[PDB]
Each structure stands twice: as C-alpha cells, then as structure tokens.
Enzyme design. Sequence first.
Site, PDB file in Angstrom:
ATOM      1  N   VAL A  65      -1.468 -31.586  43.007  1.00 39.92           N
ATOM      2  CA  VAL A  65      -1.053 -32.144  44.290  1.00 39.92           C
ATOM      3  C   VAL A  65       0.179 -33.035  44.161  1.00 39.92           C
ATOM      4  CG1 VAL A  65      -3.355 -31.920  45.205  1.00 39.92           C
ATOM      5  CG2 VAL A  65      -2.692 -34.014  44.044  1.00 39.92           C
TER       6      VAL A  65
ATOM      7  N   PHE B  35       9.102 -57.162  39.502  1.00 46.49           N
ATOM      8  CA  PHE B  35       9.014 -55.735  39.790  1.00 46.49           C
ATOM      9  C   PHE B  35       9.385 -55.423  41.236  1.00 46.49           C
ATOM     10  CE2 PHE B  35       6.917 -51.673  40.637  1.00 46.49           C
ATOM     11  CZ  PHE B  35       7.375 -50.931  39.565  1.00 46.49           C
TER      12      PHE B  35
ATOM     13  N   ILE C 123       1.569 -43.638  37.383  1.00 43.39           N
ATOM     14  CA  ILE C 123       2.209 -43.436  36.086  1.00 43.39           C
ATOM     15  C   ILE C 123       2.771 -44.749  35.556  1.00 43.39           C
ATOM     16  CG2 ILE C 123       4.020 -42.176  34.869  1.00 43.39           C
ATOM     17  CD1 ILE C 123       1.740 -40.402  35.638  1.00 43.39           C
TER      18      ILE C 123
ATOM     19  N   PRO D 200      14.476 -47.252  48.658  1.00 45.85           N
ATOM     20  CA  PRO D 200      15.137 -46.707  47.469  1.00 45.85           C
ATOM     21  C   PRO D 200      15.010 -47.635  46.267  1.00 45.85           C
ATOM     22  CG  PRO D 200      16.608 -46.799  49.406  1.00 45.85           C
ATOM     23  CD  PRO D 200      15.452 -47.706  49.660  1.00 45.85           C
TER      24      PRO D 200
ATOM     25  N   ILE E  49      -6.316 -28.738  41.948  1.00 47.48           N
ATOM     26  CA  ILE E  49      -5.023 -28.327  42.474  1.00 47.48           C
ATOM     27  C   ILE E  49      -3.997 -29.373  42.070  1.00 47.48           C
ATOM     28  CG2 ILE E  49      -3.729 -27.645  44.506  1.00 47.48           C
ATOM     29  CD1 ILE E  49      -6.503 -27.339  45.923  1.00 47.48           C
TER      30      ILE E  49
ATOM     31  N   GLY F  63      -8.151 -36.629  27.922  1.00 47.87           N
ATOM     32  CA  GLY F  63      -6.932 -35.903  27.626  1.00 47.87           C
ATOM     33  C   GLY F  63      -6.138 -35.475  28.840  1.00 47.87           C
TER      34      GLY F  63
ATOM     35  N   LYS G  39      13.359 -37.913  42.628  1.00 45.71           N
ATOM     36  CA  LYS G  39      12.891 -38.846  43.648  1.00 45.71           C
ATOM     37  C   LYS G  39      13.889 -39.992  43.759  1.00 45.71           C
ATOM     38  CE  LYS G  39       9.378 -42.287  44.639  1.00 45.71           C
ATOM     39  NZ  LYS G  39       8.103 -42.908  44.200  1.00 45.71           N
TER      40      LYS G  39
ATOM     41  N   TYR H 256      18.265 -54.990  34.115  1.00 43.17           N
ATOM     42  CA  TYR H 256      16.990 -54.779  34.795  1.00 43.17           C
ATOM     43  C   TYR H 256      16.331 -53.479  34.352  1.00 43.17           C
ATOM     44  CZ  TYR H 256      13.704 -54.710  38.769  1.00 43.17           C
ATOM     45  OH  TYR H 256      12.575 -54.690  39.558  1.00 43.17           O
ATOM     46  N   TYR H 257      17.093 -52.386  34.336  1.00 45.96           N
ATOM     47  CA  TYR H 257      16.574 -51.095  33.909  1.00 45.96           C
ATOM     48  C   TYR H 257      16.725 -50.853  32.413  1.00 45.96           C
ATOM     49  CZ  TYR H 257      16.149 -49.831  38.829  1.00 45.96           C
ATOM     50  OH  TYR H 257      15.786 -49.786  40.157  1.00 45.96           O
TER      51      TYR H 257
HETATM   52  N1  LIG Z   1      10.891 -51.435  39.336  1.00 48.23           N
HETATM   53  C1  LIG Z   1      10.983 -50.527  40.435  1.00 48.23           C
HETATM   54  C2  LIG Z   1      10.676 -51.220  41.731  1.00 48.23           C
HETATM   55  C3  LIG Z   1      10.854 -50.296  42.917  1.00 48.23           C
HETATM   56  C4  LIG Z   1      11.947 -50.434  43.749  1.00 48.23           C
HETATM   57  N2  LIG Z   1      11.828 -49.483  44.728  1.00 48.23           N
HETATM   58  C5  LIG Z   1      10.674 -48.753  44.522  1.00 48.23           C
HETATM   59  C6  LIG Z   1      10.089 -47.678  45.227  1.00 48.23           C
HETATM   60  C7  LIG Z   1       8.894 -47.114  44.799  1.00 48.23           C
HETATM   61 CL1  LIG Z   1       8.023 -45.777  45.532  1.00 48.23          CL
HETATM   62  C8  LIG Z   1       8.301 -47.644  43.662  1.00 48.23           C
HETATM   63  C9  LIG Z   1       8.871 -48.700  42.967  1.00 48.23           C
HETATM   64  C10 LIG Z   1      10.073 -49.264  43.405  1.00 48.23           C
HETATM   65  C11 LIG Z   1      12.384 -49.981  40.485  1.00 48.23           C
HETATM   66  O1  LIG Z   1      13.308 -50.720  40.938  1.00 48.23           O
HETATM   67  O2  LIG Z   1      12.606 -48.821  40.058  1.00 48.23           O
END
Ligand SMILES: N[C@@H](Cc1c[nH]c2cc(Cl)ccc12)C(=O)O
Length: 522
Positions: free
Chosen positions: A42, A459, A356, A105, A40, A12, A74, A448-449
């Site tokens: 983290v 990926f 995750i 990024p 903790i 769980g 993030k 893509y998203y």
């Molecule tokens: N599918 C992810 C691939 C990705 C591109 N930049 C990052 C940076 C980090 Cl820490 C993890 C994942 C990604 C995406 O484009 O969101």
Amino acid sequence: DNRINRIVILGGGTAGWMTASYLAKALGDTVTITLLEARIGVGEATVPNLQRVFFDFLGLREEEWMPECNAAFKTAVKFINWRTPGPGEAKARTIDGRPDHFYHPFGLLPEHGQVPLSHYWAYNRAAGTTDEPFDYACFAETAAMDAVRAPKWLDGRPATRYAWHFDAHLVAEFLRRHATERLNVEHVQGEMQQVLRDERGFITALRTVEGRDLEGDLFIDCSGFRGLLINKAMEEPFIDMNDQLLCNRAVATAIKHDDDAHGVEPYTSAIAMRSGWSWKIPMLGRFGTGYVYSSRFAEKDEATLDFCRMWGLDPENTPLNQVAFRVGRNRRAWVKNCVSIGLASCFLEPLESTGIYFITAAIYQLTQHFPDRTFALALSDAFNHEIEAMFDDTRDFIQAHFYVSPRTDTPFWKANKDLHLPEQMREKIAMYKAGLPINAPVTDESTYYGRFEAEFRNFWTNGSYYCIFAGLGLRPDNPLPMLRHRPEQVREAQALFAGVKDKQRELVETLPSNLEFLRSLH
Ligand SMILES: N[C@@H](Cc1c[nH]c2cc(Cl)ccc12)C(=O)O
C-alpha cells in the site's frame, strides 16, 4: 573483554532488515548478527535524511536501490479538503475561489535580517497587499508539484529537496539480500518457540520451533505490533495514546494507474474524509492508498465503502487490507538487553511519514548509545529519553493537524476540538498568533541535512509549523512587532518573494516530469 559478541534480531520486515544491515555495516566482524523471521503493498513515504543517514552509510546510491524497490520521488505532502466540509473525495473542493489544498514541503525557509520568509508573508497578508497562500508564496516547490515535475533534472542535477515513495516489502527484500550476501548477516527462516532468560531477566537466547537456540548478548525486537520480546517477554507496558489521536483503523489497497494521462504526482496526498483521512502514495504505474479512520466514529463497512467510492472501486471485487492500529509507544523502548525498533516500539498514523524515520532514528540512536555486556543504565536511559521525546513531539504535531483544522461538519472533526491540547502545543499556537517564529532553524540546509543530530534536535522547524497552521487557515493576530520598526528590511525582503516566483517559472519550464525520470530510472 566486555564488548557485545552476538546480536539477534526478531522479525524480518523493513525494521528488521534496516536494523540488520546498518548494525552489520557499523560493527563489521566484531559481532555476529542473526535475524529470525517467520499483504498488499500500500506504499510508504519517507523523509530526505533516509539517503544521508541510512543508504549512504551502506554505500548504496539511489541509482541502485530505487529500481529494486519501484521507488518514486516525494517533494512534499499535499493536504486536500482539510478546511472545507463534505464527502471523502479525491479532488479538492473550492474555497475563496481556490482549491482547498496546501503543501508541506521539505527544506528550510530563507531569511532576511535573520527573520524567516514566513514572517514577511504574514506581514504582507496583514498589510492587505497580497492574498497569496503561504505555501505558494514561500516555496518554489509548489509550482513544480502542480506541474508534476521531477525533483531533479534527468542527468542527476538537483533542483529541490526530496524524499521517496516505495514498496516497503521490496525494500526489505533488497536489504535482506544486501545484508546476507555482502554483510554476513545470518538469516534464519523459522518461528520463535520461546525466549530464554537468565536470573536477572536478561534474554540469553531465542529458541526456534526447529529447536535451535539463537544465542546472543543483545536482542532487537522488530516483530511489529506483536512486541514478542519487549511487550510479551520483557512485560514492558504499552502507553495507549488513542485518547489524543482518535484514528485506529485503516482500509487500504493499491490501484493500477495510467501515468500517461496526468503523470505521476511527486508528493504524498493526505485526503480528509468524514471520519479520518486517506493517504495516496504514487509510484510508477500504480499508487498505494488507504483510509485511516477512527472506529469510535465510523463502522468498518462504511469506511470500506467510503474508501472504495472515492476511487470508483467495486467494493466486492477489490482486494483490501483491513488493519487495526496500536497508537502510542512503550513506556521504555529499551529494557535490559532488549531494544524495540519499529512497530514493536511505537506507531503514529502516517500523516507526516514518520514510520521509516522512527526506525532510522532508533537505529542511529542505538549506535550512539551502544552498550557492552555490563549494559550501563545511563546508555539505555539516554536512548529511551531521545526516543520518547522524538515520538511525543511528532505525536503532538500530528494532533495539531486535527485540532487546528476548522472543520466541524462530522462528529469526528468536531470531537478533535474537544480533546485536551498539550501545554507545549498551546504555547506554540500562542507564540504563532503573537507573530513569533516556532523552532526557527539556525543553520543552512547543508548542516541540517548533513548532520542527523542537527535535524534530530529541531525536526519540525518554523517552516513546518507555518505550512500546517497557515495551510489550515490559522494566521497570526499581527505580524512580528519588530518588523514595524524595520520598514527598510521589509522593503528589502520582498526580493525573496520575487526569487521564489522566478524559481517557480524556471522549474516548471525546464524540469522534466516525474514520469520521465521514473521511466529513465526504472
Ligand atoms: N526533518 C524533516 C522535517 C520535515 C519537513 N517537512 C516534512 C514533511 C513530511 Cl511528510 C515529513 C517531514 C518533514 C525534513 O525537513 O526533511
């Protein structure tokens, strides 16, 4: 009538309650779902598809779930001191008059003439007309992160692609409440006494210490590294890959932070150390941090002291989590009627925030290959293939961070250069050095998203391989040879670098701070 009637989830934590909430939402009343669960905070980092794939499916908007998890934003991961030698310290060292840091990024790089912007940057570097780093030239996000801006305007107006930092325990509790109050998931508080199996080795029930038999047709192992079902009951072996990735320990804690002094950084930091690297996951009023190191190169005590020294912590009056890792994956994630999800399935050091995501992807792929009581082998074979390929591709990508890093100053950094490089990664480095794109994206960001299958099949795109390779100082031997036949396209492409510069000033000057948005949200 052969469809699954009952699902039982063991464990769980975050994996257990993401699995319970998503399956309950997907299956409705057609299935009864029961979760049996027996320090903790983290911090944990995520990728942008978490909202689209998971929370949107549950109908939960960020305005609701973020305040319940002390979540923050993030925009990237920032790699600090991966090119320069020296101590494990939080501040970047200087190299060629610049700080030794680079960003990774999200998003997709723009193209001109269907050539990624990365390749026009490499063209200009070779031509000697610019010395700007790749990330600052091709990503508008770099300016906003240095000015610790929020990824959105205060009224919700989006600006840049982003994901989340949060307290994983608070997320599991939020989803525990959501699942049991709105999705009719039955929560059983107890320990597992034994696993009941039939003649064919299929699990038939989990028996609790109270003597209750949790009957089911499908069982999900979310018991973490224990693998009580997949490893212990089903006897499926674990493939140790610590030969390829040397880090196997961490020392971690959370540190209170005065956000009013220098704001909240809207990115995860990965700080290179003598025998590994340290994460920093900022949230409102505090940040999580942990030193990931290899026991083959550092003693437990020196890692602890190195970690505390970086943050100016009293080592003898600081609460610390000391954890050993299991790096690798099961030979098969799904065996008979037992599906492992999360740490029970696989684990990599959180260098690129895959934890995750590996759960989200396994949950999604399970619904795509969901079985009936006949458990056709093609479904689990296909599921195991996708999980295996997802993990191994990111595993190799992680290793290339240490392999391509030019550091040789400690036995750890030098030893990474002696490990075997997988042939597919050698091929990619060779293509990168010859000027070719690697895994270039062929769709816009909305596809893509918008479609998880789109990202899952590509990926780590070209932008990400350039982020790491160029960030670590690796540059192609020459630009893409076709570009020397298209000088007019090179001239036209320069407008894109000006567009990035314009957006860099616009975001720095008009975006709110990350701290301001977090206080508006929390
Ligand atoms: N599918 C992810 C691939 C990705 C591109 N930049 C990052 C940076 C980090 Cl820490 C993890 C994942 C990604 C995406 O484009 O969101």
